Amino acid sequence: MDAIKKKMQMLKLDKENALDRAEQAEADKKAAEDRSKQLEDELVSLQKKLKGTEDEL
């Protein structure tokens, strides 16, 4: 009819916005966790370098 189509369009705008926000948040989580794990690896390498310095000391 008439109002039904508009209501469907509203329900679809909500769909697109929610789905886009979900995808963007998922990408953000992936990027942030990769950052954290690379920092942790850098920390590990620093621990090993400290160990080598302690041995030479």
Partner: protein, 55 residues
């Protein structure tokens, strides 16, 4: 004499015929308008079904 009983019904017939023709014509016009409206309602429903059809 014998002419008047015929003339009376003869003139009775003309206006009745015209009124019946007018009534049937107007009723047919209303019928066609309602038919177009009904087809339009079917068109709206089917257009909604065809556009959405899962997206």
């Amino acid at each position: 004499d014998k002419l008047k009983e015929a003339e009376t019904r003869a003139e009775f017939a003309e206006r009745s015929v015209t009124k019946l023709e007018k009534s049937i014509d107007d009723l047919e016009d209303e019928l066609y308008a309602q038919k177009l409206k009904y087809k339009a309602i079917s068109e709206e429903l089917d257009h909604a079904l065809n556009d959405m059809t899962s997206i």
